Amino acid sequence: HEVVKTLVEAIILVFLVMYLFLQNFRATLIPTIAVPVVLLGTFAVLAAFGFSINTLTMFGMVLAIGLLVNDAIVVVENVERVMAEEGLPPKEATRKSMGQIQGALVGIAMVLSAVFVPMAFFGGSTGAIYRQFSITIVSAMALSVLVALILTPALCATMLKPIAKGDHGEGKKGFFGWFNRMFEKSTHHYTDSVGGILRSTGRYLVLYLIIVVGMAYLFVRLPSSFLPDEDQGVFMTMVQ
């Protein structure tokens, strides 16, 4: 139940971060809706596979959220950027926003599942632990692509308020107008930063190599275990 609680909080924190960038309650609702649909669908798939609700399946639900929310934002925001650029109405704006990235969605989920599928095949008694998690994540990724092909596009066509051509919302009022006018922050300052690290490039490659080294260093020096001891609110005392 404690994991259920952080799961609900994770969704609410996602909903707030969605609302910070997309500043429409209508628009941040879209990705937020997708989460409950994909996650509840995943529980159903768990039942299909004869799995149980446990710490590892529950941690699947939680970790999947970054993956799911990514699917939603990718579709939603790509529409946002089709509207502020061609002044198109929501129904058409998403129709070829989808027609141009629906292949990507399917493709990417495919390569991503390669990260988790082999782990499903871990063997032994301690094998079911890694497998529960992999199936949960891959299931969620599947449903998330389904939801991104079915509900999300529909929700974009009927929930997204129109954006005029060129509009970037840089003068709403108070804070929101601030963050937008200042979102070009260094969308410009950053891309001039990137353009700089490209002219040289020579020794940005060397930095990478220390990171790979420090990684190798940190990794060999970090001890390994299985599952941590937990405080279960009880214990025993042996007397002999």
């Binding site: 404690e2 710490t55 941690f59 929310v69 890694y130 891309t191 990171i211």
Partner: protein, 179 residues
């Protein structure tokens, strides 16, 4: 144990191999997938830094959380590269020009994703109470991993892409062509 052995290396080796094969199909290229895979350390460094300087261990919850960071950072790297390439194909745009143009348009969606997630998983790192051990363990690695992945990859992915395209030539590019 005398049954155990070592699954780790080979399974992740298989994983890296199947991921590379998938990326190759995606971009129709044997080389370009490298620009996406070089991002794997950037997130592992955070996971190590996080777990290290919090006395954590390399256990089940460390391993699964890293997979996630790697997945989500792979995904952000792929979206940048997909658009940098599609601008050199459907548009004529040269390398450096189509690299920055893809970085600009994907900066927002990237930070949206990473922050919303980094922040969404913080109730796990801050957790006290029953099962808090597993919630703290799985949580901190992902957060540290995601933060390192998400700040580093934002600068390194553009570097990966151009460096790779300029070792596997074509000997025509770098001035924007004509469709």
């Amino acid at each position: 144990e005398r049954l155990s052995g070592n699954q780790a290396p080979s399974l992740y080796a298989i994983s890296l191999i199947v991921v590379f094969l998938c990326l190759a199909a995606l971009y129709e290229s044997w080389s370009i997938p490298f620009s996406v895979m070089l991002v794997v350390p950037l997130g592992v460094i955070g996971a190590l830094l996080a777990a290290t300087f919090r006395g954590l261990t390399n256990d089940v919850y460390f391993q699964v959380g890293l997979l996630t960071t790697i997945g989500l950072s792979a995904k952000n790297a792929i979206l940048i590269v997909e658009f940098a390439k599609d601008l050199m194909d459907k548009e004529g745009k040269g390398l450096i020009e189509a690299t920055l143009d893809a970085v600009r348009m994907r900066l927002r969606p990237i930070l949206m994703t990473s922050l919303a997630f980094i922040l969404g998983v913080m109730p796990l790192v801050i957790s006290t109470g029953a099962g808090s051990g597993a919630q703290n363990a799985v949580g901190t690695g992902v957060m540290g991993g995601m933060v390192t992945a998400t700040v580093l990859a934002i600068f390194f992915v553009p570097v990966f892409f151009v460096v790779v395209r300029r070792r596997f030539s074509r000997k025509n590019e770098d001035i924007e062509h004509s469709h």
